[PDB]
Amino acid sequence: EVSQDLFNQFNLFAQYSAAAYCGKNNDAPAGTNITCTGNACPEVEKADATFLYSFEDSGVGDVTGFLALDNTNKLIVLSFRGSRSIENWIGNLNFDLKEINDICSGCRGHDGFTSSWRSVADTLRQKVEDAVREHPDYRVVFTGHSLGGALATVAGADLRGNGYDIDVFSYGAPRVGNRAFAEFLTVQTGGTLYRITHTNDIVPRLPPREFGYSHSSPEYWIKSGTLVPVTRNDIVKIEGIDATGGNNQPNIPDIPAHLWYFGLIGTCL
């Protein structure tokens, strides 16, 4: 069980993450309204959030998403899209670990996620910094689903400590690095990481732990089913690095369970 306040935040960032998958949200002019086809982000539209910047296939690895301004909630939101085809990176073979000593000593991160972040960090840091300077009272939040959640986690770790807190909300994100990085992310310095997972979603169980990967604590596990509405009673907080008991259990995994985080996610076209 979680508070109504935190449940409301979890729902809102799930829709901001869902909105990154609509194609028209990746090529929109600054100042236009963020909208989603098929009711994929009704709270985003109710907040009358507008783009600051939208990007499609940038840098390395097809970095796609948007930077939004929300005057209802008073936020600066960076949202990364996960991939356009989930069955293809469960085939993924680029789980080589790379040094990320510039974020923390001994820390290693996934080759794919760190390289992608790296290719757009110059541009995105500037753009977040220009927004912060014009709206200093607004909270900055980085979010994403699936591989977008993995990118939001390494972007948040990299840019924290520059004068403004960065909260990160990730939905069905894969492990991002070694045990030293998971420990670094658990201290939660300069912002809070909320790592959300759903029932037997397969993505949060990759890459394999035997390749040096570990998950940070805590975990917010959604226990309600695929296509059933979430209530604040269905979310449980799990403590401990690589804790078992939430999403990390030895049962049969599922792909459709990855696309139901509060509503349909990853299917907006």
Taking the alpha carbons of 165, 50, 45, 154 in that order, is the dihedral positive or negative?
Answer: negative
Phi, psi of 53 (to 5 degrees): -165, 140
Report residue 92 CA to chain centroid gap: 19
- What is the resolution in angstroms? 1.8
Report whether 59 contacts 116 (CB < 8 A): yes
β-strand 139-145 against 75-80: which pairing, if any?
A: parallel
Closest Cα partner for 192 from 236, 153, 245?
A: 153
Total structural domains within the chain = 1
Structure-determination technique: X-ray
Structural domain containing residue 72: 1-269
Report whether 4 contacts 233 (CB < 8 A): no
What positions carry a catalytic annotation? 146, 201, 258
- HEC profile of 20-52: CCCHHHCCCCCCCECCCHHHCCHHHHHCCCEEE
- HEC profile of the chain: CCCHHHHHHHHHHHHHHHHCCCHHHCCCCCCCECCCHHHCCHHHHHCCCEEEEEEEEECCCCEEEEEEEECCCCEEEEEECCCCCCHHHHCCCCCCEEECCCCCCCCEEEHHHHHHHHHHHHHHHHHHHHHHHHCCCCEEEEEEECHHHHHHHHHHHHHCCCCCCEEEEEECCCCCECHHHHHHHHHCCCCCEEEEEECCECHHHCCCHHHCCECCCCEEEECCCCCCCCCHHHEEEECCCCCCCCCCCCCCCECHHHHECCCECCCCC
CATH number at residue 132: 3.40.50.1820
Estimate the crossing angle of helix 147-159 against helix 111-134, to 10 degrees.
Answer: 60
Half-sphere exposure of 93 (CA within 13 A, CB side): 0
Angle at 223 between CA 157 and CA 246, to 5 degrees: 55
Structure tokens at 185: 């992310």
d(CA 178, CA 250): 21
In the block, residue with structure tokens 């789980």: 95
